[PDB]
Design a protein around this ligand. Structure first.
Ligand SMILES: Cc1cc2nc3c(=O)[nH]c(=O)nc-3n(C[C@H](O)[C@H](O)[C@H](O)COP(=O)(O)O)c2cc1C
Ligand SMILES: Cc1cc2nc3c(=O)[nH]c(=O)nc-3n(C[C@H](O)[C@H](O)[C@H](O)COP(=O)(O)O)c2cc1C
Ligand SMILES: Cc1cc2nc3c(=O)[nH]c(=O)nc-3n(C[C@H](O)[C@H](O)[C@H](O)COP(=O)(O)O)c2cc1C
Ligand SMILES: Cc1cc2nc3c(=O)[nH]c(=O)nc-3n(C[C@H](O)[C@H](O)[C@H](O)COP(=O)(O)O)c2cc1C
Lengths: 340, 340, 340, 340
């Protein structure tokens, strides 16, 4: 009757109505190819807000044109993006949800034409372009891009900011020795490989004091790569720097075979949560209320992130409530339909 | 694999991608109380379009201020409504769906303050206001209101127009002897009680040649009321007047106890379909793809109208496809989620 | 709350606790190949009784060795079968269900080695053995086999007897002009083609006064075959002969392509029910309580026969009750599990 | 496609076809009140075997008349019980499943009329009878009862034996300081409170070398009671004594409020599994294949025990397979129904 899934959760004064989070998912719907919010986004995101999702994280938003995954990504490299993002924020919040945004940079995995950058001039695979080895100017420049992105998100009115340090993208590339072969202060050791992430966090915190999320790939799924245990010290530091919650994913630094199954990334979320003593978000094949409640009640994570399931059904929270025999507030307009 | 539910259906050159129709449902979301389309409607309806609903029928829209059910209904009594409706139409169609609108007049069941009109000065119940017995001027005036509504819907860009002659509202009141005690040419016989509906249809057809729906209450659930068989002759006439499909509902002319169960109004839809030889829409507790397919394949109706189920899940078509082991086109953005 | 699906139904003093019937389904589990009831049957059938199925119809039971579909069918051609059948009956009824048996003869569709019999020496298809054209001695002999089967079922303690006149088997072959080319009193006209069925019914009624079912194939799905309308006169006669309910199926007299979909045989059940004025059983892709309730409430059939669905879940009635928001008596042992 | 839930598991040469176990559940169906297997049990258990459950654990079976929970429990205090149990075993295994039995003694929680025994003369609650403080003769006697029960189970042909040391029953009472106030070698310390369990295990192992399970209550849910961590040393010893798997439950030593939720006992199973380095069984609100797969793949347990869910649906494994997109061997009789 009284579940944890539909119990409020507060982060730095921001109270989420429940533990349900819409995981950041690229829509590749910027038809103008200028990183601008389009009509699609204005229908896509607010629909989940009506569905009673507590927190909606907007897809990976490129902090630079080269930082995009594709030419159809959302962008935040220009003050001109603020208006569209502000409109999106207004629409989502107006319908009851808190809204966040995922600041991102694809790095060597960018599919945008032209030069792409990485810690080292090593391609993702034999079929990918060789990225440019970033100079220290490029580094502080990219850090500034993240800070500016954060400032624009703040102006747009976002409630939450997430730093995308996962899925083998730019920050993840600095993190993993598989991609980071630098021999300056940005590579060659756990501390050095973390530096870039540390500087991004600090820069963001200069202009942003709201809830701050970091999304990581807890594992590289490679013998010579990173494991969940490597991220425990990193999470402790993130905590000291004022990161509020770790959004725990995994993989994609290089091509690799992964054993995918229900809750396959949950152990990573709990590892960091209990060892680094920091709130975590669980993601990866979470599709049922029954499943989500188990994750919460057993203290494996504090928030549950839903991906593809929210693509199949934007009103998932209602089905989850039914599933758990719980009752939640429905939009007044849908009360006749939302029966418990 | 190849179901009827997800097979196209053509009405007067308008081809629906499937047989799934979103039944007209009042949202009471016109906070400005001027019948204007609001932000809510612009999120509510297009969401079902993304969900792959073939035809979306907009809620009962008052053809006059007094014709509204409540002060929060949509309205179409002014050319000023066209802009908002046109924007709504654009949003819905842009996301893949055909769009219709339900022209309505609450009659004696209107809850709007002030005078309300009906065929006879008989209240809905002992707790309702006594309506004014319409004069012949009121009648031709109300007919003109429907015509103007149709013209505005056409300008807005609607694909389908439905005339709301059901649920005990104005037109239904002229139809049922329970509410129509007039002793002129508009009451006293089956032919006379039909006159008002006939004139509305003709007037609408003067300015509208697209798909035309009529929604009826096949039964009054009263010993001295109308039965499904009474509507067979009416459907034959509607057919002659150029009505393309009969949206078959029931009840609500007066307070009455109804036996509600799955598909409880389907027999009415099939009765009219086979006896009047006219395409029909089935509505009333249709909630599963399995159920909807049975209705179609057995020739009980040509379209299936979903109500509350589309309130619980705007992407119902996907679940129905899964349910039937069928595969349908998903919005490109949701392909990773919409697995078959 | 009070559904029709879980409302009692009385046939000749036999009261079924609900409208749910387990359709006769061959298990091919007589490993001894002597038509004897085996351990499998003693677990298979009583499980559905615990599941709260109102009436359980035992699979097609060969009234003669040659009358079996396969060497692994149940048999009733010997008094020696009574003991096993009586044990089965005891087990099923002990757990709350009424029990019936389907008296059967495969005819030309028998796959048992050796001579097989039919109205005419016409094979099922070019890949099947040519059956012997039955003599009038064979006919009255086969009729006697059905009577003896009925007598043994009575001794075993069965509550209901069904005559299998469907799925292109022996009796169905006499019924359909596609297979019956006889030029005596058993072919050449509707009356003559019915004679065999008529004689079987009379013979059974000589030794059995309990509920009597007849299972028919309402359609041959062939231009020159039988249609549902042909069976209306037949059902009227069956009624006069004391047949209590018509179990309405279809097809299988010859190879043919059938359009299979949810409730695809329901229109046949309702046709006979309303035109012949006789209780009918609906069967064919009935899998949900929602669906079953619609069939009942709309008077399309009086009993609902479940096939493969009861193979997937023997406790279907519980799921159906949940589905309909209804509550039914659970076996006291399962009360903690069977929550409503 | 290849899940862990439907992957074989071997314990001491006994190979289970999958990881699905039917948790021991009292049926209170011994109407003769002599601990004898009845018809009900012979239908109840084999049904789950057909449902493709890998291992079926028979309900708590009293090793003495006073050791029963109720007068309707199964019993094994007499060689006369062997015949009935052997028949049950035959029925279950014949239909594809391995079978186990739970040797039990209710202790102070017995509801059987007359004297009841416990480590100390302390009632379960103020509403329960005061049990007799067992003498050392009673102890070695009760140990002998367990050994004899094991010997009879072996003769009956059981594949697995489980010792019921949980749910606040006799053995659990010796384990918990809440109920054990003895001041001899059987109380007053962790080692002493374990002694009784240790002696039961040894005695059972004298006459039984097959798979041996022990079911424990990992927590008393009481400030002065046992916690999961207390059972880590116990599990290490059980391992040394030849216990093959720990069936991990919790609670019921005294009245207490428990927070019940999906997988609420899983953390206990994983604790013991990883800390004591011994295979464990997870139980407690496990109802979906999705859930069960997560438990297995994440190494939280080696076997998954289903309780009430197998009461709602004896063929759960089929639904779980569907749920996981996996395909498993269906009983050849149900192949047409069991579609994947
Ligand atoms: C279409 C699609 C787009 C995605 N884009 C992003 C993204 O922009 N940022 C991100 O962190 N993860 C992205 N992912 C991963 C999802 O956020 C989510 O973590 C992943 O799909 C696993 O969650 P799920 O199994 O519940 O779907 C995307 C996934 C999908 C299916
Ligand atoms: C909230 C709500 C508003 C409705 N408003 C309308 C309406 O404006 N026009 C109409 O014809 N029917 C209206 N109805 C009836 C629905 O269109 C539909 O026919 C009815 O709810 C039965 O369908 P269902 O059982 O699938 O929900 C409304 C129903 C609901 C629940
Ligand atoms: C395995 C199996 C065995 C069957 N054996 C019989 C039978 O013995 N007698 C009969 O009349 N129909 C038999 N049929 C048809 C069923 O009785 C039932 O009418 C048909 O399968 C449609 O039911 P369903 O769609 O609900 O599964 C059998 C069907 C199956 C799948
Ligand atoms: C009707 C019933 C009888 C039970 N009897 C036993 C029993 O004999 N032995 C035992 O160890 N647990 C018994 N329990 C507990 C179950 O074995 C199981 O561990 C508990 O019900 C949790 O399982 P579930 O949540 O999956 O249903 C019983 C539970 C129920 C509901």
């Amino acid at each position: 009757m009284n579940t944890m899934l539909f119990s409020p959760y507060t982060i730095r004064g921001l109270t989420l109505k429940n533990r349900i989070v819409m995981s950041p998912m690229c829509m590749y719907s910027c038809d103008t190819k200028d990183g601008a919010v389009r009509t699609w986004h204005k229908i896509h995101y607010p629909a989940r807000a009506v569905g009673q999702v507590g927190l909606i994280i907007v897809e990976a938003t490129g902090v630079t044109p080269q930082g995009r995954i594709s030419e159809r990504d959302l962008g935040i490299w220009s003050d001109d993006h603020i208006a569209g993002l502000r409109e999106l924020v207004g629409l989502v919040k107006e319908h009851g949800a808190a809204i966040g945004i995922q600041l991102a940079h694809a790095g060597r995995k960018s599919q945008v034409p032209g030069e792409i950058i990485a810690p080292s001039a090593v391609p993702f695979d034999d079929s990918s372009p060789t990225p440019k080895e970033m100079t220290k100017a490029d580094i502080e420049e990219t850090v500034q891009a993240f800070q500016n992105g954060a400032r624009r998100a703040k102006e747009a009115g976002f409630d939450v900011i997430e730093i995308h340090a996962a899925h083998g993208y730019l920050i993840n590339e600095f993190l993993s020795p598989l991609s980071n072969r630098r021999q300056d202060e940005y590579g060659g050791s756990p501390e050095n490989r973390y530096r870039f992430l540390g500087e991004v966090i600090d820069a963001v915190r200069e202009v942003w004091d709201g809830p701050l999320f970091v999304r990581i790939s807890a594992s590289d799924y490679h013998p010579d790569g990173l494991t969940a245990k490597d991220y425990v010290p990193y999470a402790k530091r993130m905590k000291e720097q004022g990161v509020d919650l770790v959004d725990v994913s995994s993989g994609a630094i290089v091509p690799a075979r992964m054993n995918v199954y229900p809750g396959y990334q949950v152990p990573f979320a709990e590892l960091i949560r209990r060892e680094a003593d920091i709130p975590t978000g669980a993601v990866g094949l979470i599709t049922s209320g029954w499943q989500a409640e188990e994750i919460l009640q057993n203290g494996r994570a504090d928030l549950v992130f839903l991906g593809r399931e929210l693509l199949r059904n934007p009103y998932w929270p209602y089905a989850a409530a039914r599933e758990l025999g719980a009752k939640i507030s429905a939009p007044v307009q849908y009360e006749r339909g939302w029966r418990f």
